[PDB]
Write a protein that binds this ligand. Structure first.
Ligand SMILES: Nc1nc2c(ncn2[C@@H]2O[C@H](COP(=O)(O)OP(=O)(O)NP(=O)(O)O)[C@@H](O)[C@H]2O)c(=O)[nH]1
Ligand SMILES: [Mg+2]
Length: 426
RNA sequence: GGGCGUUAAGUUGCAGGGUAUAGACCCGAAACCCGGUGAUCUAGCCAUGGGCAGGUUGAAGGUUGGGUAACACUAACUGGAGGACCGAACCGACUAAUGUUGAAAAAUUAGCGGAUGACUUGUGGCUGGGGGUGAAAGGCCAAUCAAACCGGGAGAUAGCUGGUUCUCCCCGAAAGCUAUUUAGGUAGCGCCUCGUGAAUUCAUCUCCGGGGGUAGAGCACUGUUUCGGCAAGGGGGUCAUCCCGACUUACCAACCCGAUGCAAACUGCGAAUACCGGAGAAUGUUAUCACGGGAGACACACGGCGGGUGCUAACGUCCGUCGUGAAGAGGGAAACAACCCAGACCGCCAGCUAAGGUCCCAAAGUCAUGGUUAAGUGGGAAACGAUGUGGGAAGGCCCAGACAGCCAGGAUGUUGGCUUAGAAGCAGCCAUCAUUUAAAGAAAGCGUAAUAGCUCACUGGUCGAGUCGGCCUGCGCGGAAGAUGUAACGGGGCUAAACCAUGCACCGAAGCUGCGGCAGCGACGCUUAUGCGUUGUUGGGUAGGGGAGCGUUCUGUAAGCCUGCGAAGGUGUGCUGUGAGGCAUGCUGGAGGUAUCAGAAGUGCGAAUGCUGACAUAAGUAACGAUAAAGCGGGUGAAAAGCCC
RNA sequence: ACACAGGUGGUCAGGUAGAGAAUACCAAGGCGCUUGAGAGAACUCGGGUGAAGGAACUAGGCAAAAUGGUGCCGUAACUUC
RNA sequence: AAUUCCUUGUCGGGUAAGUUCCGACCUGCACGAAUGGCGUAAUGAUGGCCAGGCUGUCUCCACCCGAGACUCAGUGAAAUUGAACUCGCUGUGAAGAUGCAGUGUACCCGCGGCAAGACGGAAAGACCCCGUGAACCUUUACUAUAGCUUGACACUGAACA
RNA sequence: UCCUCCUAAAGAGUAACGGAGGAGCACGAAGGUUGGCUAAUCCUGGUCGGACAUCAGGAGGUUAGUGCAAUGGCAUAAGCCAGCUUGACUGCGAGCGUGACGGCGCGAGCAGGUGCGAAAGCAGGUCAUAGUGAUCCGGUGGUUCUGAAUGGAAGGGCCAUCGCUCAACGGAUAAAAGGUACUCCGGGGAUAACAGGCUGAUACCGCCCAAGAGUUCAUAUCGACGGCGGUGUUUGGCACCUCGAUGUCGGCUCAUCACAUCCUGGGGCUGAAGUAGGUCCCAAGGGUAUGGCUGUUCGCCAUUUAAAGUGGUACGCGAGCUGGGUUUAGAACGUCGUGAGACAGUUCGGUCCCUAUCUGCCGUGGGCGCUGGAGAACUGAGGGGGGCUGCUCCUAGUACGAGAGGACCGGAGUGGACGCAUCACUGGUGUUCGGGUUGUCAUGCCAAUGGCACUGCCCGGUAGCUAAAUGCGGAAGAGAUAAGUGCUGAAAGCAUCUAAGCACGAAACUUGCCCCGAGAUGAGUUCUCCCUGACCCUUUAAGGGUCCUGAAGGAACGUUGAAGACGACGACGUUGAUAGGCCGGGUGUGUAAGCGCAGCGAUGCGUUGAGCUAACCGGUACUAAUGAACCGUGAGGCUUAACCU
């Protein structure tokens, strides 16, 4: 059952930050959820100061209120922030008329309205599938009432347990198709076997400007806007680097607090690039007070997806609003998990980003000042051919001095192929 | 006036068609209720007697002292308690397994609980059916218990299931509408049948006299639509004198203009066919309608057409409308109710045809001629792919010689400027001209770090007729994988035995045709119940209606007649009719059977898980009753594993 | 329903070993259970023994294997003592 | 949790492996005090679970001993059956073919062995539905009444006041 | 229930849990009548006045207007205003419409009195259809109609009218709730639950288009939005098949096919350094995880292996088992119910029947066949089994690669699983082989020996037999092939793997190995061996009969077997080793008996490796296997030409 719940309708919204201990979503970020969802917003019903209930999630009275609010203002749907167990939705339904949805199914709905690549399709509908598989379970009741209550002769196994197995088969089927996929992108990753494989990946919330930095650094077409899901689909484009020249890039989708469980499980394919990635570049916003939290938000999922062992590089993007500083190097240490001073739409901070990077990935800077007598056209050749002369200075009788800095694999492919009696490089 | 009437042959039999009340054809329910029988099984209770081996624990208590004023404390010693243990007798059933047509309508074997107690048992007693009983389960109440057994109102009713017996000729349904405590029922009418009546009653064909709003078509309207319009109002705008306001709308969107379609519930149009009245001919047994006597039938399926629905599915449902089936046999599509052809009164070792076929199974063309197919297409299929091959129109090039290959040239500006280590025909970038010449691009591909080679585009020459395509089009390939065995022509097998067209022969059904019978039916003549005579015509059939019968048994008829020199009964035998049947005669029989025409019926059986009586069948199989075994010598004895010693 | 493996009350209690009216073996006393004989196949029944391993089997240690006795030694949580 | 749906919730203990279990945890889908709650000595032919032991349970089974199976003799059964000359493959078809089609194979006839089929036997589907079938209970279905409750009047008199 | 529109097929009429919708009244005027008026919407102008009120002027032609659904209706308006009015009367109805009926609709004219207009003439409810109830039993009112001895009266009818959501609307009655798991009765495939059957929306597999990513790149690999197919497995519908019974999930024995490929096998490309992969193609030969957890299939987890392939097969397999889940009665919890009661909410407990006729299956038989008869040896017509593979070194640290890392092929080894076969080894096993010993019994007693107690308990072991033991086995090479790679080579001057014609090419194909195998009804080969007698009548492919012959060979019985269920199949039957014996050896138990002698004794010491000894090896005619008899024969059918006479 790949079915979609629509985004873009009138809704009684109910939310309660006002729970007292877990807390979460001041509302406004949830409103953004609502926004990029395209929901027809109506009103913001809100309850009080409660621990969550075995009842109707929130309190009795407030529940009755949202019910009436629906019945009067005519909301197309009771949107209801913060997740619940299915029966909770059930009892809530008894007091209403319309579809209810937790934070989850919202996020899936919008997610699916965003799907464009077939990969995104499968992992989405997968997350949709695993999610709905739970919730269906109480719904036997009607189906049972029409069934007669005894007379299961033939089958031993009960129905709907049947349906349970159905959706299990769906599940395995979906992932089954997912298999050849991760294998696919992996065949793309065999190229990551070549020893010369820089491999960055970006991370942050949605509207962490990820699209933007990616833009300016790439001179490539990746659209960016206020909305959540401002990007979907990993996106490869190569870039320059002072010490490995080629340098593969691939943008990740932006994050939120408490992104869905099964989402990730479906989403491991897409992030499968992140894991291997040799460096976790991480943009962060500079306008929100949300700062810390978002990092704490991001760290969350990073944990569950491994490779949080990776060296990282923070970029306090959006320095424009703040005039935090002139863009700068910001050695957290000689180690450099550095903060970096950006405003990506201006992107004024870049050169320090690249330079700091230039410090952060290498392993052989013993430079050499190479030289030859009229036999260097081939040298200049190799140097432009592969990476870089650091400096080209011709001199007397065709004797010509140079400086070059390459990673060692070059040094030996060169020392081998060329006579290299020129012998400045090893 | 209008309604009924005015009107104008009935009644008693008798045979019979119904229909009414009764068991109304027979078989069959769960229960309902009344009168009776039980407590020997068990449940409970009552009196009265019995049963409970062996072992072990040790309360209370007692006795003696520590101990302390004493108490507490406490020694032992005895003392013998108890829904107590351990385990036989007796009780009881937890686990396995056999056995489950078993040895036994709950046993068997091995393991288990109680076992001096709310125990167990002898023997008698009392409680009874809507009642008893209940350590209560809805369990027991003679193995039967959510209300016993057993006799009677009892043929309880049964709108369901079953089945309902001899023969020919005639006719032929329906599976619908309305209503239905109705949906598998039944009733009124539709349809069949019979009997009576009467319009030339009707049906086809034509001709005339009609009506119309679907198909189609169409865009005013109805709503929809696309794009130009067009102005267009307008939130802007616009500007500025602040603004008089001008101006701008360059967005905005009507209204109307032009052209585009779209429609079950839009229509300024509007067919066929049907419907409907008149007219006429021929043709059909008045085919019509009215009436009276009887029905069943009320659930239809598929096919062609018109639809709804569905998924423009289903052997799907639901209507329309029509065909076969049902209730129709033949032939063909291999096998085929629902397709094509054709409605079997019966015979005939005659004939011709139908659809459909004709190299063999296998009936007939190895038919004629013309054209295509290269695949076994035929003999399973698409979007789609392509120097497959047939066909076609037209178009391009060319004997001033093209097309293919082949001889050679490939140019100067100028390595274009920019880029840059280097770019320059080929890192780019943008310019990319001008020249020469038949010829050559600042460039189509390779190459170089880059530079410089390498090939065509370009052409001369060469060579000598055709050459390059798009379009249309028949017929073919690619796409194209299934379950147990070739299995997607019936097979053999095909290269014509495929396929396209034309023609001739022939096969091929019960249809038709000749020959021969039989039967209705009308018919006019004949004739009178007559008979005929002639002729036309007809004769597949379940529900169901109608006509004729066959046969048994009794009664009349018979004190007839048949029979002992063989009646009835069995089993032969031939003779005979359209038939059920008769008739003849050998075998047994050893006693009775009934022409003829009447009379009446328990009157005709293959079926009901019919019912009794005889006998098949598994099979000469499984088994023969506890796995506590016998061996022997002698005895009688028709015989000795059994018995006698 | 039977010469059926079921049930049926009360009396009697020999030895030898052992607590014993169990078991073990015999007294007195009955009994060889009304079809056999041959043969030594699967399979079933009822059993006897296993190398290695030791519950991996299996719904589940089901079955089966596995402990017994006498005396002396010593005997936890917890205990309503 | 004998309570939970969700749910193999979370948590750690036990396991190489933990849908059970054990103990916490507390968003108790939908615990709660006589409709008794919380504990607990001992008690269980009680529910779940672990460890020691042994073990043909098994991994895989092997021979031995018994009684049936076999043959021989005597006896002498049943269940069931439209009729038998009662092959496969593949079609076909009241839609799962021994019986048709076309095709393939195959002397005549027992014995013991195996149980896929012969929609094999056994009993009128208990499931499901139908029927103006029945029974039994149920309660604020109706409609009746027993027992019960009020009141009259009679057996019922007397006086006063 | 009733009304309008579509479905509806140009008339009616026509259905669906098909498409839209209205209705249970309103009015004494919204009615009778004559007299007059005629629409919305639109432009200009104009006080508040405005987009939009009122007024003028035009425009325009009912797009307005109908008491409300809708559709047809509508200018002589029906719509509108106003006067007059009760025709919203009264008894009658030519004759029509649609109804099965009940019943419903229109109707002129007339009778009797109205009412309007001058008159013509207009009025028996409204523009039209929707606006509602039969029956009974009663009420109110009238009543020139009855009234039970007569006179009244009560009562009834006659006529007027009233009493209903009887709305499940043709209305079972004044009066009408649930539960069954305790179950029941008669039916049903006329309708569910299982499975098939049909179909493929769904699911599932390809296929086209190429938006894109895939570091540049659309097509190594992915493929967006979209399309056509295929499979007939998943979920569904469809209810034709079964309810006079087809047993249902999981496991457990057991396989069987497909190929839509899990490995191994062969190839194309690669984003193929090699290592490896990824896809694609070709391939069905074989092979393809034990455990934990839960009834599970799954799924998850731990560790493996080359691989842990898919799916079909009544979701293969209950007349083979299993009975944990599934669904009964017991009970409990939460929860819903006032309840009895239920719940797919969970927990406890809970009976698997069939001795095999047919089929087909596995063995193994007897009859007859094969042209006189045997006896042994055959050939191969056909059939089956057989098919896995790791891991190590050698090639060689080589080709590869900067390194790391590490090959191709060839060859050597050495295993897992599986199959085949023998006991010699290792053992297993051993109820007949020996010894130990508790209980007791008996043997007169005695130390001595037997009986019983699971074989009494135990101890080892021959033989037989068996894996756990041990050898052997799956090829090689040919033949013809796939996919692919080729040569040459034209049709088309060039091309070109193809048209011609050669070269390749794999666990698959056919052989190559083993087993089977003339019932191979085509009934075959070679070799051996045997019978070569007379007479009689009938029909003469023919005998028949006499008589006389009986052969090789067959058996029949018996001795027995490593042969065997029985059969069969061996070995032997006195010219003999087949058995049992018997003799020896061998074999294991472990040194006996009796006696001797140290010890009071239990016992011992020496007599002594003792005796004891199967299933065995070597030996031996002691017993048994005797001989007649019995089956079978007596010389071999015609044709046909060959060669010989
Ligand atoms: N002031 C400011 N605005 C910024 C900055 N970076 C991005 N933005 C704006 O914030 C929005 C970020 O869009 P986006 O890049 O898509 O955010 P994202 O984090 O990439 N989301 P996603 O990864 O889903 O695309 C855009 O409007 C972007 O221009 C920044 O550094 N400063
Ligand atoms: Mg981004």
């Amino acid at each position: 059952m790949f079915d979609r719940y629509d985004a873009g309708e009138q809704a009684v919204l109910v939310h309660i930050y006002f729970t007292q201990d877990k807390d979460m979503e001041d509302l406004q970020e949830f409103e953004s959820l609502v926004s990029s969802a395209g929901v027809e917003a109506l009103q913001v019903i809100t309850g009080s100061r409660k621990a969550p209930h075995p009842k109707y999630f929130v309190g009795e009275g407030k529940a009755v209120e949202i019910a009436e609010a629906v019945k009067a203002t005519g909301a197309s749907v009771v949107l209801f922030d913060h997740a619940l167990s299915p029966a909770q939705e059930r009892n809530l339904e008894r007091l209403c008329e319309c579809r209810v949805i937790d934070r989850t199914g919202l996020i899936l709905d919008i997610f699916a309205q965003r799907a464009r690549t077939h990969e995104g399709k499968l992992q989405v509908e997968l997350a949709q599938l695993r999610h709905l598989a739970t919730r269906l379970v109480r719904g036997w009741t009607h189906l049972e009432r029409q069934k007669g209550g005894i007379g299961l002769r033939g089958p031993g196994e009960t129905q709907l347990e049947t349906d349970r197995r159905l959706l299990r088969n769906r599940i395995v089927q979906i992932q089954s198709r997912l298999e050849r996929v991760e294998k696919q992108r992996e065949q793309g990753r065999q190229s990551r076997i070549k020893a010369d494989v820089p491999t960055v990946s970006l991370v942050g919330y949605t509207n962490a400007g990820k699209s933007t930095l990616f833009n300016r650094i790439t001179e490539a077409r990746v659209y960016a806007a206020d909305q959540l899901f401002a990007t979907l689909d990993p996106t490869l484009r190569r870039i320059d680097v002072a010490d490995v020249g080629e340098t593969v890039l691939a943008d990740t989708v932006g994050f939120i607090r408490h992104l869905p469980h099964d989402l990730v499980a479906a989403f491991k394919a897409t992030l499968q690039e992140t894991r291997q990635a040799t460096l976790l570049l991480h943009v962060i916003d500079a306008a929100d007070v949300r700062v810390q939290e978002n990092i704490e938000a991001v760290n969350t999922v990073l944990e569950e997806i491994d490779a949080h062992e990776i060296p990282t590089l923070l970029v306090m993007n959006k320095i424009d609003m703040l005039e935090d500083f002139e863009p700068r190097i910001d050695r957290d240490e000689e180690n450099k998990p550095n903060r970096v001073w950006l405003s990506a739409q201006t992107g004024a901070g870049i050169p320090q980003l690249f330079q700091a990077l230039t410090e952060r990935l290498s392993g052989e800077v013993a430079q050499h000042t190479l030289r030859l007598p009229p036999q260097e056209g081939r040298l200049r050749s190799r140097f432009y051919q592969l990476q870089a002369i650091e400096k080209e200075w011709m001199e007397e009788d065709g004797s010509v001095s140079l400086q070059v800095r390459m990673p060692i694999v070059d040094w030996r492919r060169l020392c081998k192929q060329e006579p290299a009696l020129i012998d400045y490089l090893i």
